[PDB]
């Protein structure tokens, strides 16, 4: 799963026999193993399928050590393909900003970035803000220059709550994983 | 929120001189480094600060290699604390579920896992569903048993749309990583 | 090659700036890098793309250390997706066996494995062979047991070139790994 | 070769004295008395009962072997191991022609081609078919221009692979 | 205070079932594990807690492997937060230094480094010294130059006792790790 | 230095030539290298000596990258032995406990552990405490059983400051690195 | 063998296409055109100008080589590498006698000894001297009891090594 | 062997309980483990001691997985110090060269290297040799340049058994690594 995601199939109970290892999708492994009867998932979370090419019944596995096929709700040692469930769509973040403080004045909501809040919003300062999802950097200047502040919480009622000595912030941007 | 992640500070530019490694949050390394002119971030995103105990001008450094401080928009060479940003992958994950097909009849919206549809809600079948944020697993039988189906951020107009030949679904989970 | 490849993209020349790493295919990394001017392939062979979703122009990158976008024949630094390339190990070996030593008798070829060459091909013993490519195991009996001998890509007139003098073999196998 | 390593235990269930190898060892009977379990983290390995690769011999893929009977072994008696360099590459073949997928013009040599016609007399290659391996076309010779990718298959048009003109002057093999 | 360190929690005993890795402080993993019956601590010392946000009954686990919770004197199987203990190696480090031999004459006690004896104190030579806590470096010339001598937690009755043929010492540092 | 401590010597400036690596003391390496002209210290802090068997002039090196022998204050490429400076003597911790709270009543000081504070100190409860060095676990019962509390700070004025709902603590113990 | 790996770069200063080996490769001219830098992370390696170990050949310890002239190389032309298994062990010899450090009783065979006198007729060994390697004495035979350790040296008393009685019945070699 | 050894001590049988790891000698680990009933040597060969400061009874432990104190012949679980053992690589090779092929001429031996065998031994060419043990390099000239050939532990009557037919060599070297 690209952050250490890997999964290892074994042909005997309790991690024995031949072992086959997979870092990505793999649409068939019936060549390497005849049967899979235990799995260790060291990284990530896997769709694992009975036949090859992602066919048959599907069982899914996160990090952990599975010594018997029944403790993934399996029904045979028949497995043939696996797909990594790659994580949530990054498109989940959102933020609310206010003109006056303590959530007063005109308030504007956005799931995207903001180069010049003067231009897209016609506000000079920002005195309070709720983060509803995600994490955000506040910039004192347009174009993501200047003093930086990190909004890793939920709500903020005046600029010092994000560690600013002034309401001068003029652009903001989301971080992603 | 807890995997590999590492930051390295060098006294001199181009990754030279005394070196200090932070693999989690450090509130004062001024006794190891007198200065920092170059950073390497092998993993994660970091907030570094000019002063210790996370104060002063702060910069965010993603993975990357920064041979002088002007590459992290640094003002000068004084840094003193480092904090690693957590970027919750377990954000919101909503799902809607209906008792009739094509989103008719009774319906619920949940944020959380459910070992028994007919316990927590009063639906025996499930015939349509909306996934709003995240990706979920549908189970044939109560308490996360039976055949599993996997449901990404889509809409599902009939049970056949998530694979299932039937509407016999009586538990569901959200994914986490 | 196998699934252990890994490629890393840098935003500046000489392996500097923000860095993104793949070990599997990435539909988009435009939400991670503004540009790309150096690449480091640590494993595998990769196909890289100007645009997300594998559109645009395509450059092929083998293992090595690429300090500039012109050292992979690129037209500029706009890349947006990548995807590892495979080398057909499910179709990378055949064999030619021979009833009489030094290629007398009649010539029997396959690219599959053979359980009981009696059952499949109607010979009692194998006296010669040339292997097209691949590595192969002979066993004494049909069920793949008994003494085993292995055969790298070459030409053996008499059973002495592999590990015995008895002609007794009744099963053979290509090995994928 | 890449990341291969094998471990021999004098006792079953991966206990006792343990001796590790990642290339070949012609005799390790001095380090190891018996051998009743093996771990193979990477690669496939040939294991010989006696030193310098003699005696009965077993193959073992990666996997975990707690008894000698699990690798079909006869006793606990083994003393040398060779790693098997499975032939990587060597199957890339080709074929070309200046008209549409017909045995008219031909060319079947498994080297490289910096020039459409210097490395083999031909104006422009109009279609092709590999017999194994993966090959790369280059819109202009000495391997410049638009890169294009072909897997072991048959082609019948410069649009059966993604391109515009039949403009094609170079062909290179891949190995991994 | 910042090197490798890792803790692993298993849903089931003897290191089995779903697994969760903490390499720095985690304030709530109840959404990854419903339980924990076995822990592995590869690095560092940890505080784990029954409830999230570091509350409830707490246990300290050093490096080790704990196959049931009764091995960490656990009361039951509910754990929810993990915090890594910092054990400051840069504790106190005092040194005394005299202008005469055998601890006679003017003398100072310091906790901190000193680029010039004859700047901060008014001694040209240094002829005796006591190391109270820690280990220090003596330098021939001011500003951490010249020949270095190394001084562990000992007493030093004359300059010859720390190696030096002379008393020409005019800077010193403490060690840090 | 046993927590990842390693050092690498190179026979050319800027990390080139033959490289020799050392995890422990090494009383000679003039066989492997003729000259050392750059060093990378990846772990720990090293005494490094001019001749073999820890002889000649001594230079010491912490973590960092030293491309020229002069930037460790060297004078030649002559080096022959190295010793790891292993960290501070663990014997630095100390703690003060009080009968009444806010540092009242009889007060007892100890640099060692305490099995039964009733027996060694004849105190039933402990209502306040200063840690002067080290880190300590408080036990509600004798013999290090019972509820655990962690004193990772400096001073504490009533039991809840170490998270206790009661003054019932009866043994305490130091942690070491 | 243990942890050895070598990297060949087509370009100087560790750039270009790069091919890695940790066992031997008989020919890698297909993966690598030229070679102008090498990195050797582990082990010592023999590098041959031509395939299957032919041509001129250079040794390279671990180290970092940015030019071919840094390994005394003649060109950029090389195509195969063997890892050199430096002989580990093989020098442990011995000698024993029942009186005090005198060539009276003798015994010089470089195997093991579970029994003071069955594996070689002698009551108790009273002193000894190894000619190389490191050996271990055992207070009682079949290698039980107080262990004692001898480096390549000469001894002249069961107190020249740390023990009480001259009680000594077993001797075992070490290899690492 | 070399410096890459590593041994790990467990307080319970079957590699359980608290664990301490060494890669270099440890005068005391009684401040870390109450007991020891299983050991894991991952590299090297180790000498372990009942008491700190290498006193008490001594057990020698080669690479392997020791689940019980009786499987290293111990008398109980009180161990308190350890220290790696070396294998004399500064005295592990000699050679015997020969003026005339197949051991005619007179017999010249050393265990050192030889720069100019002309200067040292008064021969123009080397026609035979047997190597006692060790690996050796012949060069064409005295300064260790020219063509090189290597020689593993064996017996070569004519210069054909090593890589040439010309007798021209004037320098040779034992290699330590």
From Swiss-Prot, chains A, B, C, E, F, H:
Positions of the Beta/gamma crystallin 'Greek key' domain: 5-43, 44-86, 93-133, 134-176
Molecular-function GO term, any one: structural constituent of eye lens
Protein name as catalogued: Gamma-crystallin S
Name of encoding gene: Crygs
Record note on domains: Has a two-domain beta-structure, folded into four very similar Greek key motifs.
Alphabetized InterPro entries for the sequence: Beta/Gamma-Crystallin, Beta/gamma_crystallin, G_crystallin-like
Species of provenance: Mus musculus
Function: Crystallins are the dominant structural components of the vertebrate eye lens.
One annotated GO biological process: morphogenesis of an epithelium
Family: Belongs to the beta/gamma-crystallin family.
Renumbered residue ranges of the record's region N-terminal arm: 1-4
Record keywords: Acetylation, Eye lens protein, Repeat
Region (Connecting peptide): 87-92
Alphabetized Gene3D superfamilies for the sequence: Crystallins
Record note on quaternary structure: Monomer.
Modified residues (N-acetylserine): 1
UniProtKB/Swiss-Prot annotation, chains D, G:
Chain ranges of the Beta/gamma crystallin 'Greek key' domain: 4-42, 43-85, 92-132, 133-175
Region of interest: Connecting peptide: 86-91
SUPFAM superfamilies hit by this protein: gamma-Crystallin-like
InterPro entries with a match to the protein in the record: Beta/Gamma-Crystallin, Beta/gamma_crystallin, G_crystallin-like
GO biological process, any: morphogenesis of an epithelium
Keywords: Acetylation, Eye lens protein, Repeat
An example Gene Ontology molecular-function term: structural constituent of eye lens
Pfam families associated with the record: Crystall
UniProt keyword NADP present: no
Region (N-terminal arm): 1-3
Top-level taxon of the source organism: Eukaryota
Domain notes from UniProt: Has a two-domain beta-structure, folded into four very similar Greek key motifs.
Its biological purpose: Crystallins are the dominant structural components of the vertebrate eye lens.
PANTHER family, per database record: BETA/GAMMA CRYSTALLIN (PTHR11818), GAMMA-CRYSTALLIN S (PTHR11818:SF6)
Family, per entry: Belongs to the beta/gamma-crystallin family.
Subunit composition and interactions: Monomer.
Record-given protein name: Gamma-crystallin S
Organism in which the protein naturally occurs: Mus musculus (Mouse)
Gene name for this UniProt entry: Crygs
């Amino acid at each position: 799963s690209k952050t250490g995601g890997k999964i290892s199939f074994y042909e005997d109970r309790n991690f024995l026999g031949r072992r086959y290892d997979c870092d990505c999708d793999c649409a068939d492994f019936r060549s390497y193993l005849s049967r899979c009867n235990s799995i260790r998932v060291e990284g990530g979370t896997w769709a694992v399928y009975e036949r090859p090419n992602f066919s048959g019944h599907m069982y899914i596995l996160p990090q952990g050590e599975y010594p018997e096929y029944q403790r993934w709700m399996g029904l045979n040692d028949r497995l043939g393909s696996c797909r990594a469930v790659h994580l949530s769509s990054g498109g989940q973040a959102k933020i609310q900003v206010f003109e006056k403080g303590d959530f007063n004045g005109q308030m504007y909501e956005t799931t995207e970035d903001c180069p010049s809040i003067m231009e897209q919003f016609h506000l000079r300062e920002i005195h309070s803000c709720k983060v509803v999802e995600g994490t955000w950097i506040f910039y004192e200047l347009p174009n993501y220059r200047g003093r930086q502040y990190l909004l890793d919480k939920k709500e903020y009622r005046k600029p010092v709550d994000w560690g600013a000595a002034s309401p001068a912030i003029q652009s903001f941007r989301r971080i992603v994983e």
